[PDB]
Amino acid sequence: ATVNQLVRKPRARKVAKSNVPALEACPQKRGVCTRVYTTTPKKPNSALRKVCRVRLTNGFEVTSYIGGEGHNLQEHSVILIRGGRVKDLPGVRYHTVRGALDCSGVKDRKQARSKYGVKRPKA
Amino acid sequence: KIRTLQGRVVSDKMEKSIVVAIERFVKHPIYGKFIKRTTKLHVHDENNECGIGDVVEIRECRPLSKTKSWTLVRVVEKAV
Amino acid sequence: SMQDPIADMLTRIRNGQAANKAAVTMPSSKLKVAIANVLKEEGFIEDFKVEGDTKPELELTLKYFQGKAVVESIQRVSRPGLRIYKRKDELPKVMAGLGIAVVSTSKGVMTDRAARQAGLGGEIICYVA
Amino acid sequence: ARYLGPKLKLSRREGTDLFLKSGVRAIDTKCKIEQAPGQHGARKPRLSDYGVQLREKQKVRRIYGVLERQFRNYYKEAARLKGNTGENLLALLEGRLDNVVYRMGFGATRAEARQLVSHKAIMVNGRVVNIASYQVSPNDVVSIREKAKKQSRVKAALELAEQREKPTWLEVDAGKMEGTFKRKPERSDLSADINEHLIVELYSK
Amino acid sequence: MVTIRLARHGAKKRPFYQVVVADSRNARNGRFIERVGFFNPIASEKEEGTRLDLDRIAHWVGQGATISDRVAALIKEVNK
Amino acid sequence: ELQEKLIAVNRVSKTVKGGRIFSFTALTVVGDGNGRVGFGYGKAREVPAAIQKAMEKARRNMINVALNNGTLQHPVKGVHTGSRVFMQPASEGTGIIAGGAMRAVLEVAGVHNVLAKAYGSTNPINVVRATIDGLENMNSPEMVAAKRGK
RNA sequence: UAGCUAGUAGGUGGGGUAACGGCUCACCUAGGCGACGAUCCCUAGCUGGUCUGAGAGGAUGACCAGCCACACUGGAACUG
RNA sequence: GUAUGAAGAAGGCCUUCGGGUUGUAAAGUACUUUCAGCGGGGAGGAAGGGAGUAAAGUUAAUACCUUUGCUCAUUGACGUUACCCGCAGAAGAAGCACCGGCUAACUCCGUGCCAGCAGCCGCGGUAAUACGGAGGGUGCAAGCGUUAAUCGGAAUUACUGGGCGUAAAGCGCACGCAGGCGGUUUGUUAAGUCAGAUGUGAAAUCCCCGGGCUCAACCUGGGAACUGCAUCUGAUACUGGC
Known part of the structure; x- marks a missing residue:
């Protein structure tokens, strides 16, 4: 290659770019939620998926997955969303989380209790 | 010792000054390729024995006006 | 067009020792006879000899080892589009001491070994192994 | 943990x-x-x-x-x-204090030797040591602490250590409950x- | 003024001092002109636990520089 | 002395007109213990027989290599089409490192002191012969002593 | 992002200022700049460093040091 | 906490039921108490200054101030300090994710193309040890998992260390401005070059080698480098200028 041009314009390569740019370098963000619904999965997986539509304060509007068994969500119910891809959903690169606001407690489990925070018994 | 350069006149359109071009003529530090790298200075001269295309020798001295610090010594090729 | 007098000499050596030639010849110069006297005693050629004085020529007797050339690579590196200068320790190590670098110097054409032994540097001519 | x-x-x-x-x-x-x-x-x-x-x-x-x-x-x-x-x-x-106490014969297991370090029952250079990760210095003296020098389980560990070969890089006296750590562990033993x-x-x- | 002072190092509980020539202007831990050695208030088991060039102190006194009482005690700590 | 090694075993499971294959392909190295190295390859129904099919030719295949004091002293490259090898001298108490093929080819040469890397295709049956091409490229100070002068 | 500037380019003189200088007023000559990217925009304080890689390199310059700019917007002068 | 404690108990999990495994674990016994809790004793950070004593201090020997020393009253937010003693008594102190391949740990049950997982593989349509759980196990542990940003794997941006006939691409062809390269011999100047030498290259930080409280964290001495830049005095082959 012409080195007498590399001294003016170097070699350039493709840069890495986010699959979740709407969060803008935050680990989770708040949305009011405009719609809570279900959608049929990608490929022959035959398992109905739970999703919500979220518009963000920065002008983005995206779709999020409702992880953890059991929920109470509606329009204007207010939720937290984070990163993490779902491969069997159309365009769903976001996860909805329930450590904050008004989302109901997850269905209880005896293992892996960090998953959507399985809450300990208390009297 | 003081700093002195050889270069050439590229404009003589003003009376008591000449626009002089100087070069680096050196390798690029990460490519080894020669780079000419021209820079222009607005050099003082009230003698008027030189003009455009003349090869000229200049010296570093004190500022005389805004952004101007270099002055003429001699004509190097003496083509006229 | 015709661009370099040393490529016209190194090609005759490199391709001649690939084609099993006894002795190869090209136009002479002060530099060409200076490097021949290095390549001789460093054991990369078997003889060198000049012919003529007006339009002078140089003939190099090629050297062989175990049915191949005595040389494993003779590389230019210092070329018309890029010349290389090396200082007294900045001199590279060619094939861990199984080869040489050739330096012009202000004090005579020699190896990087002789340049280190003199605390000397200069411009590179070639790297030979 | x-x-x-x-x-x-x-x-x-x-x-x-x-x-x-x-x-x-x-x-x-x-x-x-x-x-x-x-x-x-x-x-x-x-x-x-x-x-x-x-x-x-x-x-x-x-x-x-x-x-x-x-x-x-x-x-x-x-x-x-x-x-x-x-x-x-x-x-x-091998050079950790928790293993030097073991090779001096004061405990019949490494956990019974580490017990003496963790319960502050050992001293090095006459100073009490509680760090099991300690790297013992050459020509330095290791000994059982005054408040622990009567333990019959240590006299009994030594009763057995008198029947064992010692590392060449250290010594120990079964009476004093004391030994010089001569060298860092060596590939010759x-x-x-x-x-x-x-x-x-x-x-x- | 230009003064010979102890710069605070060693962090918490066991401080350590670097003896410097510095200007008393503005910043406490500002830039320092020259270092002349180190001082340890804690036992180090070495007879060079504290090191000072008493002739270089005499050279900075030869620049008219100010002395601090803590450094006069350091000159006493090397037994003058 | 024993130096001989097994680099890789590969299970063949495809279906053909003769039925479904249940076979194994092996790759081994041996040498002479004095200055020669070589490799062998072979497929069989049982692994000990595949190892023998390979070993019997690995005991025949030879190339001589310049092995000064059982050590590498210069940087060396080796090539075979899509597979490339690069080997350099290590420091005191350091050595191999690298893929299991290079690790075996150096033991049949008596060598340990090598910093090795592979480039391009990591294919085992090419990177082995590219390593042996890199040993054709290995030089000795004892041979250069016979080249110097005249 | 392809055209930029004409207080701009060169010069001279007055006035002010710690030195120098378009800093400032008035005038004379007619330019100057861009291809090595001026003009325009986006992002960003910079460095010793921080973290990482065998290295070339990559990301990042909080806290701590060495400089900077700023403190509701903008202009201004004075005090030491 | 350390040791010892059985054809191997009570309780579980695997098990045509042979045995296996939890497990020497427990119960039993021995044996030692760190840390903790509480009571007792209690450093160092409190020096520096000040008072007396001494000094032919310097000055004009007892104003200030200085002095190697001696002797004394003094200063604690941290604080129920550090450290040690004493008292029982193993007493008060443990989770997280994963265990079919890449991937170390192994099975058994539940779910049944539904739910639920995933990086690839794809799993699951009622033997998925791939989704939930249990027993055993693996790894790490006051952490462990999850997400975000950005790096190391990456020789996939290219000197170290690639491609353009057919697998990314030689411009359809020629001409050519601006830019780059260019045979030989004898001089000359000494810019580039090479040599010698000095300054500059902060502390911290790193690397390499040491030292300090019982270690490490933390703190700190040494060695090294900062490729270069600035300047001086030489060398003189080759390029540049002549």
């Missing part, structure tokens, strides 16, 4: 004794009568090369009872001073039946 795993089942698992529940008996040993393979050996699969490394890594760490990040610190300390990562790594584990050609493939990367 503590491992709390089994003492002898692991010795059998790699076919190599860990000086756990086995250092002082030959009869009435309680070692599960040296367990014959039964129908288990016929049903054992081959281990992977990634697993052969891990079997070595865990064995070499657990025989001394040490922390992972400290065992890795010794892998960085064995790389310098022309020490060889395959050679000084063993001597760094340090040997182990471990894969010394395999421990070099660790932490890379």
Whole structure:
């Protein structure tokens, strides 16, 4: 290659770019939620998926997955969303989380209790 | 010792000054390729024995006006 | 067009020792006879000899080892589009001491070994192994 | 945190004794009568090369009872001073105070020797030491603390240590409960039946 | 003024001092002109636990520089 | 002395007009223990027979290599089409490192002191002959002593 | 992002200022700049460093040091 | 906490039921108490200054101030300090994710193309040890998992260390401005070059080698480098200028 041009314009390569740019370098963000619904999965997986539509304060509007068994969500119910891809959903690169606001407690489990925070018994 | 350069006149359109071009003529530090790298200075001269295309020798001295610090010594090729 | 007098000499050596030639010849110069006297005693050629004085020529007797050339690579590196200068320790190590670098110097054409032994540097001519 | 795993089942698992529940008996040993393979050996699969490394890594760490990040610190300390990562790594584990108390014969197990360090029953240079990770200095004196020098279990560990060979790099007196640590552990008396050609493939990367 | 002072190092409980020539202007831990050695208030088991060039101190006194009482006690700590 | 090694075993499971294959292909190295190295390859129905099919030619295949004091002293490259090898001298108490093929070819040469890397295709049956091409490229100070002068 | 500037380019003189200088007023000559990217926009304080890689390199310059700019917007002068 | 404690108990899990495994674990016994709790004793950070004593201090020997020393009253937010003693008594102190391949740990049950997982593989349509759980196990542990940003794997941006006939691409062809390269011999100047030498290259930080409280964290001495830049005095082959 012409080195007498590399001294003016170097070699350039493709840069890495986010699959979740709407969060803008935050680990989770708040949305009011405009719609809570279900959608049929990608490929022959035959398992109905739970999703919500979220518009963000920065002008983005995206779709999020409702992880953890059991929920109470509606329009204007207010939720937290984070990163993490779902491969069997159309365009769903976001996860909805329930450590904050008004989302109901997850269905209880005896293992892996960090998953959507399985809450300990208390009297 | 003081700093002195050889270069050439590229404009003589003003009376008591000449626009002089100087070069680096050196390798690029990460490519080894020669780079000419021209820079222009607005050099003082009230003698008027030189003009455009003349090869000229200049010296570093004190500022005389805004952004101007270099002055003429001699004509190097003496083509006229 | 015709661009370099040393490529016209190194090609005759490199391709001649690939084609099993006894002795190869090209136009002479002060530099060409200076490097021949290095390549001789460093054991990369078997003889060198000049012919003529007006339009002078140089003939190099090629050297062989175990049915191949005595040389494993003779590389230019210092070329018309890029010349290389090396200082007294900045001199590279060619094939861990199984080869040489050739330096012009202000004090005579020699190896990087002789340049280190003199605390000397200069411009590179070639790297030979 | 503590491992709390089994003492002898692991010795059998790699076919190599860990000086756990086995250092002082030959009869009435309680070692599960040296367990014959039964129908288990016929049903054992081959281990992977990634697993052969891990079997070595865990064995070499657990025989001394040490922390992972400290065992890795010794892998960085064995790389310098022309020490060889395959050679000084063993001597760094062997040179810990918790093993010097063991090689001076004061405890019949490494956990019974580490007990004396962790309960502040040991002193070095006449100063009380509670750090099991301590690297003992050459020509320095290790001794049992005044408030612990009457323990019959230590006199009884020494009653047995008088019947054992000592490391060349240290000495100990069974009366005084005291010994000079002469040198850092040396390859002229340090040997182990471990894969010394395999421990070099660790932490890379 | 230009003064010979102890710069605070060693962090918490066991401080360590670097003896410097510095200007008393503005910043406490500002830039320092020259270092002349180190001082340890804690036992180090070495007879060079504290090191000072008393002739270089005399050279900075030869620049008219100010002395601080803590450095006069350091000159006493090397037994003058 | 024994130096001989097994580099890789590969299970063949495809279906053909003769039925479904249940066979194994092996790759081994041996040498002469005095200055020659070589490799062998072979497929059979049982692994000990595949190892023997390979070993019997690995005991025939030879190339002489310049092995000064059982050590590498210069940087060397080796090539075979899509597979490339690069080997350099290590420091005191350091050595191999690298893929299991290079690890075996150096033991039949008596060598340990090598910093090795592979480039391009990591294919085993090419990277072995590219390593042997890199040993054709290996030089000795004892041979250069017979080249110097005249 | 392809055209930029004409207080701009060169010069001279008055006035002010710690030195120098378009800093400032008035005038004379007619330019100057861009291809090595001026003009325009986006992002960003900079450095010793921080973290990472065998290294070339990559990301990042909080806290701690060595400089900077700023403190509701903008202009201004005075005090030491 | 350390040791010892059985054809191997109570309780579980695997098990045509042979045995296996939890497990020497427990119960039993021995044996030692760190840390903790509480009571007792209690350092160092409190020096520096000040008072007396001494000094032909310097000055004009007892104003200030200085002095190697001696002797004394003094200063604690941290604080129920550090450290040690004493008292029972193993007493008060443990989770997280994973275990079919890459991937170390192994099965058994539930779910049944539904739910639920995933990086690839794809799993699951009622033997998925791939989704939930249990027993055993693996690894790490006051952490462990998850997400975000950005790096190391990456020789896939290219000197170290690639491609353009057919697998990314030689411009359809020629001409050519601006820019780059260019045979030989004898001089000359000494810019580039090479040599010698000095300054500059902060502390901290790193690397390499040491030292300090019982270690490490933390703190700190040494060695090294900062490729260069600035300047001086030489060398003189080759390029540049002549």
